[PDB]
Design a protein around this nucleic acid. Sequence first.
RNA 1: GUCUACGGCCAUACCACCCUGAACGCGCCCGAUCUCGUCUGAUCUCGGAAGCUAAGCAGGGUCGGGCCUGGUUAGUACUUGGAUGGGAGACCGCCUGGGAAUACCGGGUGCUGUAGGCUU
RNA 2: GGACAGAAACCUCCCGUGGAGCAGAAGGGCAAAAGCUCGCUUGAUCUUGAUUUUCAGUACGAAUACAGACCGUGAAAGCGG
RNA 3: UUAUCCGGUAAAGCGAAUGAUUAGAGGUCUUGGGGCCGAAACGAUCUCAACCUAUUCUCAAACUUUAAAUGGGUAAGAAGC
Lengths: 293, 205, 48, 170, 159
Amino acid sequence: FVKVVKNKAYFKRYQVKFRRRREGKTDYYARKRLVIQDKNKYNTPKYRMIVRVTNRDIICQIAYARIEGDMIVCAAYAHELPKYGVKVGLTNYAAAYCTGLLLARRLLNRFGMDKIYEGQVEVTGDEYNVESIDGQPGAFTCYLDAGLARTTTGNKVFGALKGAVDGGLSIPHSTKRFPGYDSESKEFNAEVHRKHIMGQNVADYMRYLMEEDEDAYKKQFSQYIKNNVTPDMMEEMYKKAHAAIRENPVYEKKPKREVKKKRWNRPKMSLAQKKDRVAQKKASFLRAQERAA
Amino acid sequence: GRRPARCYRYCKNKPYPKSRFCRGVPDAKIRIFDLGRKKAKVDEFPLCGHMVSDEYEQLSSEALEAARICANKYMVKSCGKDGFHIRVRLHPFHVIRINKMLQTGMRGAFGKPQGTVARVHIGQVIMSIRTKLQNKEHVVEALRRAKFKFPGRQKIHISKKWGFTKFNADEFEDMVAEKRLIPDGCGVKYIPNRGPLDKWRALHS
Amino acid sequence: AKSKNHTTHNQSRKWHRNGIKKPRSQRYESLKGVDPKFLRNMRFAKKH
Amino acid sequence: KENPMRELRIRKLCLNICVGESGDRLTRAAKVLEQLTGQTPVFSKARYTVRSFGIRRNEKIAVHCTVRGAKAEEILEKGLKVREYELRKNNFSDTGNFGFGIQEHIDLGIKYDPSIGIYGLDFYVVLGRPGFSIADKKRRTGCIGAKHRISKEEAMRWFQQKYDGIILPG
Amino acid sequence: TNTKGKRRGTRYMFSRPFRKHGVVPLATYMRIYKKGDIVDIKGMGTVQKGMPHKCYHGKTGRVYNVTQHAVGIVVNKQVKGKILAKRINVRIEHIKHSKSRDSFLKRVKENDQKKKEAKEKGTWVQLKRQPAPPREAHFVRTNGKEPELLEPIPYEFMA
RNA sequence: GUCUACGGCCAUACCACCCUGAACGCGCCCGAUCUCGUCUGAUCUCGGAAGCUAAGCAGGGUCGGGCCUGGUUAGUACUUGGAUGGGAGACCGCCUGGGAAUACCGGGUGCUGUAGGCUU
RNA sequence: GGACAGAAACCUCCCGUGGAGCAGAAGGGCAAAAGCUCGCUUGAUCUUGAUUUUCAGUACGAAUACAGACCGUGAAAGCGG
RNA sequence: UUAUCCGGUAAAGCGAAUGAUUAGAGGUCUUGGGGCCGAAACGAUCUCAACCUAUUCUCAAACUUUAAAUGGGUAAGAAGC
Ligand SMILES: [Mg+2]
Ligand SMILES: [Mg+2]
Ligand SMILES: [Mg+2]
Ligand SMILES: [Mg+2]
Ligand SMILES: [Mg+2]
Ligand SMILES: [Mg+2]
Ligand SMILES: [Mg+2]
Ligand SMILES: [Mg+2]
Ligand SMILES: [Mg+2]
Ligand SMILES: [Mg+2]
């Protein structure tokens, strides 16, 4: 026949990966080079601007490494955008910019530097770096963490990066992976980046669908219709969302409702129960065998 | 032209078996370790005796085979052709080195392999014989005769186990009646209660 | 004209005759071999 | 009733031609299935050198292509129509995939060209179920699952019930 | 004579333990090391950069210099006649904190606390670690049953 | 009670199969115009929200394999020091102290850090 | 499993803890890498010190942490004399 | 002595990795060898061989899951809190 590869000795010699590696969530090779501060810094925190894109929202946080795990200082999500004006379309490039801007301004509010480090009040789409000013406390600087995202040109991870940079965070970067950097001539024009920041590509697609096939337009965009969001006012709405975010970036926690203490999963079986089950099974098997014989 | 056993009678050196670093070793003289009707069930051959050494010595492969032949000859003569089972529980692996002169002298003194020798510890069993209960005197005489083929001191002991098994003879039939042991030829299979119950229900089926 | 090659028989007795003394620890160990940038910072601090 | 997410759909239909040599014959064979599939195929380079076949390492000896979507369905349909919608159960693998081979590409519906000649193809179908993408997704790769696999019996039942084919024993 | 290789005879010393191969834990990289801290040396074969020499494996030293990835330490190496307090540079993953100093630190903090306390109360307490004294007199209560009688068992050849 | 994002310790967490998943979340899933990449929108990137727990993922189960930790093995094997001890030797016994590993037989099957949710 | 296809040519699916590969002899080490394929480049560069390795605690060779400029790569954290 | 770190020898193990090594068992068409009914047929039948599954006997200075005794560093304060 065939030799059983996963035999009793296979598990004896088997070495498991880390829990995150087995689950595939994290990349420890990049984490080592991302979270490890120099030893001569003597416990100076190193901040990573973590960006994650899910199927329905975008998570933007900043964290520093510790022996008991990372500490989340400021967390910004995309499901809270409807509080600011973006009612629908929370997983696009424009939403990535908005949540990155929200994370930056909220962090500045937490550290009490809202008025200082204004940053890009209005969008431009070109390269920009927050330059620290003398006398005033120095600017907050962190480093981008894309995780496992395949960082090509025009990624929503970089969109969140641009939003945070415009928010006032001095994150090192370059205008190479931003949408608009063409590779045939190796140059960057801010106009295309501005269109992607404001979601003009989505509006153009919306116009294209409603012009060539209305039924497919309904099939693709339906929540936009339900929220009566037309392409013409798309950029104006995002500008309003940017103004609202930069106005009131604070976060308030929802009140903790008191539970009724109801368990939703079957509790673990105990030793007595499992030792009784085999006794019942053996007794049933023999009593069935004798009466069937 | 083989040297007397008195030369290689002491476990003088650390074990030096035939391996990737030792090539050209001549094949061991003894290659058959089981004799008689080795295709015998554990039920029909309860009695078991053992030839066990009483010193930390070295037994050559040729000595092992000579004792095996002598024991086999007596068993087939007394108990019958198909009425016993002789198992040699020592395999010669420690190869021995021979330095031969032809006037080089002691320069480059490292012997080439000459033969294979089995190293025996205190109380380790050298030979085992399994047969019926009434054939006890014949086995004792057979091993006593084979003692003369070995150097050092060896003794004959009749183990309390059931044949070539690690279970006591008195409780062996009781356990197999309780269906804790399954005969599978010259040995037995021990059935614990730690497996899935499908095996248990199949056995009790 | 052969002779033995290496020996370490009486060496331990030779060592312990004068004693295997540990190095005499002394307060304010020297600052050689430290990071030059850190050393420059310290010297500037002592200067000012 | 049944959960719609367990529907058996074709994930990939791969067509390859192994001419066993490089050069004009390789290009000529490549043009055949290129004209068939409407897309550029890819050459495969040999791994080892054996003198029995006269093939050496890194030698482009076969041309293969993969087709998805509706065009894969049409190619499979015209491939089966020359096999008369019949297959042997040996063609079905243990993993729910199957395949067959055609001796000449002319019978599919292409027009013969004396400069082109005739060439055979191997049509291999790998069936699939919604959710097989987690077996190769980059972010969180996971095992497909015991109940979500496609059995050999399940695959042949799908074949004989969807295309109304027959699986004679053998 | 033997070869003078740097890693000669380190087949098992630098080898990773059983079922602990692969990616190194990040806790070692995250721990901080001040100068003057007592530290231990244990070479690890996963990272070959800044490998401490085999003569220092298992030794305990004091940190006197810290860099971005490695720390400079001073260790006592025994040479033929004397002991040399020589300084080496070792990458951080080959080094770990030692609890030998921590035990003294906890004890000195405890006795300082118990010296500040009860000082104004007038009582005097023991502070020096007295060695384990001989067991004091005590009563053994044979509660009923007679003590078991033990005798050597007869010899039998189990083999 | 529990989930998501980032983790620490790296199987008590793995592996095979089976059962249950309120809500939220994670996904499965629908398309290629744009960003982007392929032989193929399969993967990747992007734009999404019709349907679905079927799968992953969560919890539970297997007189489960494994893994962790106990008893047995056993004061056995081995061993610091000692003897004008035995034995021709091989080696063995004793005094003073330390003290293993199999097989075999039991128990258990992730703890927790920061932030944000569901259980209004 | 799939035409010629055969034991071995090529294509597809599943299992697959390193049973492969890393230039050589061997050992150690390595699985989204240290390995296989690409893209871009010369940190195989210029300079002063400190330390480890046989050690006499002297050299050469080799090696390790840093420091000052010029850089390469990557979106970046970082990595590379 | 009290705490705290390092080892891979002694011992032990192959139902655990690697290299050896013995003999019984049960499987199947996974193949071959000695046949047989057959145009043939995995249609069927004894085997004998290799293969798989649990086992069993004996080994390693250049093997090892475990793992000592002896031993090797550090600390046991006012150069400290
Ligand atoms: Mg990366
Ligand atoms: Mg010798
Ligand atoms: Mg798709
Ligand atoms: Mg599910
Ligand atoms: Mg178990
Ligand atoms: Mg938690
Ligand atoms: Mg890589
Ligand atoms: Mg430099
Ligand atoms: Mg050694
Ligand atoms: Mg040994």
